[PDB]
């Protein structure tokens, strides 16, 4: 493909990011380590995991479980 309809992972167009990957910027699949590197590069947005997405901040009513 020149571009993907859904998500991009490992040189392939995929329907969803399967576990243990996370949906990033609504177009690519990233691993935990990548999301972790973004978070620590801030320590802007310190990236978090929610609903199988690597996102800039926790949604309303939620807080960062620091570790994971």
């Amino acid at each position, epitope marked *: 493909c020149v571009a993907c309809r859904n998500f991009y992972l490992d040189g392939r167009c*995929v329907e*969803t990011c399967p576990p243990p990957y996370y949906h990033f910027q609504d177009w690519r699949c990233v691993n935990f380590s990548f999301c972790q590197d973004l978070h620590h590069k801030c320590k802007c947005h310190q990236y978090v995991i929610h609903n199988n997405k690597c996102i800039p901040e926790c949604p309303s009513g939620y807080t960062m479980n620091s570790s994971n």
Partner: antibody
Amino acid sequence: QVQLKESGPGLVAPSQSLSITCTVSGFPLTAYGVNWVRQPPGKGLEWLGMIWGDGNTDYNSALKSRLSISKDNSKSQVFLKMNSLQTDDTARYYCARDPYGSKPMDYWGQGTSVTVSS
Amino acid sequence: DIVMSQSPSSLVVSVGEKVTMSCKSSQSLLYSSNQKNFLAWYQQKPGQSPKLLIYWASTRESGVPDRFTGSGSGTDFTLTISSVKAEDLAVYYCQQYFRYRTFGGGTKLEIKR
């Protein structure tokens, strides 16, 4: 086009190791996963492990203690190594393409019969 | 650890009859992100390798007859064959591919003649 074929020894001495090679064609190992599944004679399918496009692996918590899965992207081949086989490891061993994120295991190898015996 | 349980262990049916079989997982296989179930059904004919029939619990794999229908969500799934053909004789397995992969014990389909 899409193909997978397992190259096994067919007979393994009890307490010895099993090595298998799955040679694939028609797709790149960099974009697809390869799983290993075994079927003991007249029994079901048991998932052993998988190797993702990015080379990282997942193993069956049982067999994890004595199982390795690696690959050579350039040679389009995936390797299974299993330590100290016993009678109960006698089975047909399959490698199967895992188009993860889109389909489950879709393309299966014909399988390789492994007999654990003296 | 996801456990897959299939029922019945086996069933016998004559050509043309409808058949239904169950698959139950210890954990929900429903992915929040896409509201799809990470469940598949495979057919394994004697002496052949397994063939994918259904994925996403209900999506029929390319080249799979319309006779086969997958239904269910979360933990309880069903495979239905509307009108069994003589060629449908096989063992049917369900697999979860949510995180790692697990196969059910299989349902053996036999034919009455």
